[PDB]
Each structure stands twice: as structure tokens, then as C-alpha cells.
Amino acid sequence: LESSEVLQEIREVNLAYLLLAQRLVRENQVEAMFRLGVSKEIADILAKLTSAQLVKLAASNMVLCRFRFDDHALLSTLTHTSHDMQQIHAAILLARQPVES
């Protein structure tokens, strides 16, 4: 059923990700790879995208990103109403998660 307003939110999210990804890689390549969980090869691609390249990729009408959590058992315990270190806890797991090449 998705179209009209929904497609507007999809294209906006894709752009915001790419803008952050380039801002992260440009400031520091290695630090960016850590946050995005992405290989050195891809980071070179994201930083090297020009303004016109971004417009094309941004408004693809498709969900460019995929979720970084695939274990429902982990997600429920991570986001549960008890120690509140859930924010720190998620960082340790996502750090060991492999990059994408």
C-alpha cells in the first residue's frame, strides 16, 4: 500500500544516511568505519561521491539501508525497561560485528 507520503520519508532517510556517512568518513576514515560497520573500501566510495551522485542514490524510492540487528532475542533484552547500560551494551556487540566488503 506504500506510496505518497510514505515514499517521501524513504527518500529523506536515504539522504540523511549518506550525508552522515560522508561527513563521518571525511572527518576520519577509520572512526567512520567503526560507526558504520563498513570496510575501508566502501568508505572510500562514500567519501568520493559527488553532489550529483548523492541526488541519484538518495531518491531511489527503495530502502537503501538494512538493519544492523538480526537476533530478536538480543534486541528485546537490549531495549528493555534492568541496569540502563543497554546503550553501552549495544556498543560492545556492534563493534565485533564484521564489516561489509
Binding site: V30, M33, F34, S39, D71, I92, A95, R96
Partner: protein, 160 residues
């Protein structure tokens, strides 16, 4: 005796002072004289170095709250060497920068001093501390040397 070599070492020395490195950490990772660092530390920060000796104890890094910060900090350091293709004190610093970055959100005080962070790396480099994978969540935390796995549960999955 290279002038450039001296410029880089002094440049590295200021970086560590900004992160709160103790005197000993400076002597280890730079070729600068012990006396020159004191003038540098006195120029950077108001007073002279704390004169306290390096901690080198593993009991601190197994307390639950420090264990969290260290197991978190190391996961960044591990990534820096394994996939970041950056090793050495540079890798140690870049990991601490992210550790400090993550600290701001929680709002708690920085529990891992840069010296303790640098101490942790020398502990792992010297095979005195080990990484155990959590049976429940799967995240790898720091534990004592030669402690057995397959029965491990992390501090976050099961606090005291």
C-alpha cells in the same frame, strides 16, 4: 637526532597530555627526555605531573563497572588493529577517542583513565588478560588469564 623526528615526538607528547596520560606513558611512547616532558606538562596543564606510579593491576579491570568500560574500550581498540589497519599507540589513542565519545551519552564520569586504557593494552599484549565470549549475548568481554569459557556470562546479561 633528526629534527623532524623530534617534531613528531613532541607532537605526539602533547596529544597524550591532552588525554590525561601519566608521566610514565609519555616516557614509553615518546623519545623525549623525562625532564622535557615535565616542562611540557607544566606548560600544558597548570601543575606538574601527579608523580604517581603506573597501576599495573588486574583487579581493577575485573570490577563490574570498570570491566564494562574496558570491555567496551577494547572492542574499539580490537577493531582499530584488526580492520582499521592502524597499530601502536595511534591505535590506542583512536580507540580512547571513541570511548570518550561514547561516555558523553551515558553522562557518567570517565571511569577508564587513558593510563588504565594503555595499561589494559599492555596487559593483553603481554597475554595476562583474555577475552571471553558471552554464552547468552555473544559479546566478548575481558577476564582473568586462563579462566575457562563455555560457562561465561557477561556483566550486562547477569549483574551481581
Amino acid at each position: 637526532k633528526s629534527v623532524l623526528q623530534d617534531a613528531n615526538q613532541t607532537q605526539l607528547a602533547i596529544e597524550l597530555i591532552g588525554l590525561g596520560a601519566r608521566l610514565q606513558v609519555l616516557e614509553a611512547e615518546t623519545t623525549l627526555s623525562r625532564d622535557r616532558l615535565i616542562r611540557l606538562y607544566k606548560e600544558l596543564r597548570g601543575v606538574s605531573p601527579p608523580k604517581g606510579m603506573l597501576p599495573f593491576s588486574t583487579d581493577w579491570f575485573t570490577t563490574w563497572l570498570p570491566n564494562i568500560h574496558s570491555s567496551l574500550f577494547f572492542s574499539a581498540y580490537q577493531f582499530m588493529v584488526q580492520e582499521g589497519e592502524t597499530v601502536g599507540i595511534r591505535a590506542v589513542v583512536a580507540a580512547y577517542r571513541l570511548y570518550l565519545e561514547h561516555v558523553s551519552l551515558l553522562g557518567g564520569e570517565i571511569v577508564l583513565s587513558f593510563t588504565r586504557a594503555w595499561t589494559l593494552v599492555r596487559f593483553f599484549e603481554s597475554n595476562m588478560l583474555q577475552l571471553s565470549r558471552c554464552t547468552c549475548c555473544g559479546g566478548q568481554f575481558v577476564t582473568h588469564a586462563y579462566e575457562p569459557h563455555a560457562n561465561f556470562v557477561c556483566s550486562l546479561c547477569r549483574p551481581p
